Amino acid sequence: LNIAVLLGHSHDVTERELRNLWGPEQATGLPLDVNVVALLMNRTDPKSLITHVCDLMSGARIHGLVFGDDTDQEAVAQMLDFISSQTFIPILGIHGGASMIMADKDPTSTFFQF
Amino acid sequence: KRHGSWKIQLNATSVTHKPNAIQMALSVCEDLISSQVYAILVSHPPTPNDHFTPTPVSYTAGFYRIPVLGLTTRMSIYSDKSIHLSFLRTVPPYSHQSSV
Amino acid sequence: GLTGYDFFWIVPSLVSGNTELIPKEFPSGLISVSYDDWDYSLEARVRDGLGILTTAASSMLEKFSYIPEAKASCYGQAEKPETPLHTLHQFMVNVTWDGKDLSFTEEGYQVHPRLVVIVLNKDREWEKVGKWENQTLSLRHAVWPRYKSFSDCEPDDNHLSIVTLEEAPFVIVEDIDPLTETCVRNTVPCRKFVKINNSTNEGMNVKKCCKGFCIDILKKLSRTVKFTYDLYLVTNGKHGKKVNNV
Amino acid sequence: ITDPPRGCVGNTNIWKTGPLFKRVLMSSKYADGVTGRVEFNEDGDRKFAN
Ligand SMILES: *[C@@H]1O[C@H](CO)[C@@H](O[C@@H]2O[C@H](CO)[C@@H](O)[C@H](O)[C@H]2NC(C)=O)[C@H](O)[C@H]1NC(C)=O
Ligand SMILES: *[C@@H]1O[C@H](CO)[C@@H](O)[C@H](O)[C@H]1NC(C)=O
Ligand SMILES: *[C@@H]1O[C@H](CO)[C@@H](O)[C@H](O)[C@H]1NC(C)=O
Ligand SMILES: *[C@@H]1O[C@H](CO)[C@@H](O)[C@H](O)[C@H]1NC(C)=O
Ligand SMILES: *[C@@H]1O[C@H](CO)[C@@H](O)[C@H](O)[C@H]1NC(C)=O
Ligand SMILES: *[C@@H]1O[C@H](CO)[C@@H](O)[C@H](O)[C@H]1NC(C)=O
């Protein structure tokens, strides 16, 4: 369904190329909705992160999040896990601080890491 | 008053507990921009009368490595520096009771 | 003086950190295990994330129809009770997508993560040496190349290249144990170049286990003279012979 | 000694002396206190409770 892919300046790839991943992403469309909303993120302030996540949540009701970061800040990972508990949004850490492994997550959080 | 003749001043700012953890983190971050604080304290278990988790404050001030000094929470989730980067507390956690 | 030619240091990805930043006092040949795979591009990672999310959505669709479980808003928890009725937590723990298994664990780890074994070569750069394939490890170098650690002095002299040959009472060669992939207490590792076939010149260094009278003599010699060796079997022919003055 | 910056104005950085300030706090000791003697252990929790 409605899934958000949120990247920073990693490789400076625009959101259009992220939106291009609709055919290969479940070509045999089971929910016939699989719409991908791609946003660009300039800085990793926790206030900005929370605002972006929950505003995009209020916008078109995203059912997931694929978060990638270009900074070596592990705290971002934590700032996602906490959010996963407050929003019940499955979040997937891709690159940077988000992909840094986390020891213990609260059970009510659906955050997963690569 | 009782810290010598040095002419440095200590100023105190405070924010109110809110039921929303998201609003708690947002208020703490706004507070940050609003005071250039040096440390943050969290000591209210019963005022929200809930899980009372100071986790939003700990995460927000550990993003900038600003030390947090909790005074009431005794859970062991705050005793590992990998998860909570800049957390300290004046009350030992429940896991210390084992020693007794 | 604990970082010579013979000394080996293995560190996790925490020590190596950012690949581009290579500090001083890091000896060459430093072995690290990292996940920052250059072959794993950002687009591939986004594709895999979208795939796992969509597969979890399909797994939910198979069981129930109230799949669009979305929270009401960004604020107002005191005015809104929790509704954690159905979630995708329990479905994508077991999942296969695009012909590869991307299952997770109960703690948020990958069951088959794409690990990489990197080394710090003589150029002060991180090079890809090994890969985590399935649940085993694939190494590019069958025998370990030795790197100039200090890059300032102390060249290697106590490492010997030793050749030997299969003779019944003196050198006994046995195949490597499938269960352990390590030589038994009585044998020592010994490589042998085995050709792929007749016509081709390509081959691979099969690691066999070498024991016997001469091998025990060699072990005692290494113990006393205090050297190290990479024992291997000859392939050109027998012990020795001169043909056409060669 | 640097200073803690803003929370939402182009500041992804951290307090350079943040680890230093945390180490200073963890190295602090007392002999008198309203709660009694206060000293933090290696993990940063209160040491010698009652
Ligand atoms: C000392 O702390 C007090 C805490 O109330 C500060 O008062 C607040 O300061 C912020 C930013 O300076 C303002 O946005 C608030 O409106 C103030 N609150 C009130 C009730 O006036 C005070 O400014 C601090 N003194 C400093 C930083 O010199
Ligand atoms: C991101 O956007 C904000 C908007 O105010 C801007 O201040 C910042 O410089 C931008 N970052 C870039 C362009 O790297
Ligand atoms: C895991 O998923 C596969 C998908 O075909 C299924 O066959 C198998 O029964 C599942 N195992 C479980 C749910 O334990
Ligand atoms: C190696 O991975 C492939 C990927 O599909 C799998 O088919 C194969 O069974 C794996 N090998 C072993 C020994 O499990
Ligand atoms: C395969 O290798 C053997 C030697 O091990 C050789 O005798 C045989 O001819 C090869 N098969 C070919 C080249 O088709
Ligand atoms: C390779 O080919 C030669 C020439 O025909 C043949 O005599 C020999 O048996 C082959 N070697 C093997 C068996 O690998």
Side-chain angles (χ1 to χ4, degrees):
Chain A
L1 267 158
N2 192 34
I3 302 158
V5 196
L6 201 143
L7 286 320
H9 290 7
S10 295
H11 309 44
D12 200 19
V13 158
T14 190
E15 34 257 40
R16 178 202 323 285
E17 310 320 287
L18 317 168
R19 298 213 81 154
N20 279 237
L21 290 201
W22 159 89
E25 294 321 279
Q26 199 79 95
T28 58
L30 265 288
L32 58 76
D33 284 342
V34 58
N35 45 313
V36 165
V37 179
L39 267 275
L40 167 75
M41 183 205 160
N42 279 12
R43 75 204 170 290
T44 85
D45 275 339
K47 200 198 111 176
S48 278
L49 185 41
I50 292 153
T51 316
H52 283 344
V53 169
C54 92
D55 285 12
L56 284 49
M57 161 85 188
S58 307
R61 332 294 291 193
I62 39 184
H63 296 358
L65 212 168
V66 191
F67 184 94
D69 172 51
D70 49 21
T71 88
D72 192 26
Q73 181 66 286
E74 55 267 71
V76 180
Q78 281 111 49
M79 274 281 338
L80 288 170
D81 185 53
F82 159 72
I83 271 168
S84 308
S85 52
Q86 310 319 296
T87 65
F88 310 97
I89 284 160
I91 297 179
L92 266 153
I94 292 315
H95 166 264
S99 177
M100 291 205 48
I101 206 57
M102 198 178 160
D104 306 307
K105 301 165 183 89
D106 42 334
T108 177
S109 98
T110 43
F111 180 52
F112 292 77
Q113 292 175 299
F114 279 177
Chain B
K1 290 156 127 317
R2 66 174 195 168
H3 279 72
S5 64
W6 191 227
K7 306 301 181 179
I8 204 83
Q9 291 295 272
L10 280 301
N11 201 50
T13 180
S14 61
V15 86
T16 52
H17 272 256
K18 295 253 291 183
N20 272 113
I22 290 303
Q23 290 269 40
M24 188 25 81
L26 292 173
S27 306
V28 172
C29 205
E30 293 177 350
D31 184 1
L32 295 174
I33 186 167
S34 91
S35 178
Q36 313 237 359
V37 296
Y38 268 63
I40 313 184
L41 271 54
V42 285
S43 307
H44 266 158
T47 313
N49 198 100
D50 62 344
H51 53 307
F52 66 86
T53 53
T55 38
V57 179
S58 184
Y59 288 156
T60 300
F63 200 107
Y64 312 94
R65 298 296 191 282
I66 297 163
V68 168
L69 245 180
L71 308 179
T72 64
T73 58
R74 294 190 72 209
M75 307 267 218
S76 304
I77 317 160
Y78 307 82
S79 275
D80 47 347
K81 302 296 104 168
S82 79
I83 302 285
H84 296 277
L85 298 316
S86 61
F87 201 93
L88 298 155
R89 57 184 154 194
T90 55
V91 281
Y94 293 139
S95 312
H96 284 39
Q97 301 184 119
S98 69
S99 301
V100 177
Chain C
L2 288 166
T3 175
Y5 253 100
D6 82 284
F7 273 86
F8 301 113
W9 297 80
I10 322 185
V11 298
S13 59
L14 160 86
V15 167
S16 56
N18 195 358
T19 279
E20 287 297 333
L21 171 57
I22 301 166
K24 204 161 67 71
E25 303 112 343
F26 260 33
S28 300
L30 187 76
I31 321 181
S32 198
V33 192
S34 168
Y35 186 80
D36 173 38
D37 199 351
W38 325 265
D39 306 349
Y40 209 33
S41 155
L42 180 58
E43 283 311 285
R45 272 148 152 171
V46 162
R47 178 190 295 248
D48 287 334
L50 291 203
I52 174 50
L53 291 177
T54 50
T55 320
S58 79
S59 289
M60 220 187 204
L61 151 73
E62 279 190 84
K63 315 304 298 304
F64 324 114
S65 300
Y66 180 66
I67 313 307
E69 176 65 83
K71 202 170 183 287
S73 182
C74 174
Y75 316 99
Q77 186 155 98
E79 302 167 287
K80 294 164 163 180
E82 319 98 294
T83 62
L85 227 47
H86 308 297
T87 178
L88 318 87
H89 187 273
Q90 59 258 6
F91 293 150
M92 67 178 212
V93 171
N94 167 22
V95 56
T96 298
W97 158 266
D98 263 327
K100 52 181 175 186
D101 174 20
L102 266 43
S103 296
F104 284 87
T105 59
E106 278 75 3
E107 311 87 317
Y109 314 139
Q110 258 163 337
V111 308
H112 308 310
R114 299 158 73 75
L115 271 298
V116 167
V117 179
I118 46 166
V119 79
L120 192 56
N121 58 2
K122 49 163 284 296
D123 320 273
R124 293 286 171 161
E125 214 266 346
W126 286 108
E127 204 141 21
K128 180 131 63 193
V129 153
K131 160 168 64 39
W132 197 239
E133 183 71 8
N134 253 305
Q135 286 275 347
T136 81
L137 172 79
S138 325
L139 291 159
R140 189 176 76 190
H141 299 260
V143 71
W144 186 234
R146 308 167 78 72
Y147 297 87
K148 193 37 211 155
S149 86
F150 306 90
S151 307
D152 82 338
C153 57
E154 193 69 16
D156 52 344
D157 281 342
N158 287 20
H159 194 68
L160 310 186
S161 171
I162 300 190
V163 65
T164 184
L165 188 51
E166 172 78 341
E167 194 62 279
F170 307 101
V171 179
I172 298 146
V173 166
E174 33 182 88
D175 262 299
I176 188 49
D177 306 8
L179 75 157
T180 44
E181 295 285 72
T182 88
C183 278
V184 307
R185 80 218 169 288
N186 195 28
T187 73
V188 304
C190 73
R191 98 192 194 235
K192 157 153 188 218
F193 151 76
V194 176
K195 309 187 142 193
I196 287 316
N197 281 100
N198 229 26
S199 316
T200 196
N201 270 9
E202 310 321 301
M204 61 155 198
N205 287 359
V206 182
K207 149 165 162 66
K208 315 280 213 331
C209 285
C210 279
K211 68 184 189 185
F213 186 93
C214 283
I215 302 302
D216 277 55
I217 280 288
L218 174 56
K219 286 192 295 185
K220 248 168 289 209
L221 284 178
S222 63
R223 194 171 340 290
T224 304
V225 193
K226 283 162 262 299
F227 60 79
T228 73
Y229 52 98
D230 60 340
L231 183 74
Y232 80 94
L233 316 183
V234 82
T235 54
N236 197 351
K238 305 307 169 297
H239 316 91
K241 179 170 189 172
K242 207 183 75 154
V243 283
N244 283 33
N245 247 32
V246 157
Chain D
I1 317 274
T2 344
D3 133 271
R6 297 294 181 192
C8 207
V9 181
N11 289 337
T12 298
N13 289 337
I14 69 120
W15 191 8
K16 344 288 147 322
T17 61
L20 258 288
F21 194 22
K22 178 109 174 292
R23 202 254 301 272
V24 163
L25 272 150
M26 264 199 46
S27 49
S28 65
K29 292 182 208 3
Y30 269 79
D32 188 15
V34 188
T35 62
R37 215 172 80 72
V38 49
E39 184 180 328
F40 301 108
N41 81 305
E42 295 81 11
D43 306 83
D45 309 289
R46 182 73 161 270
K47 202 174 206 208
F48 306 136
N50 247 340

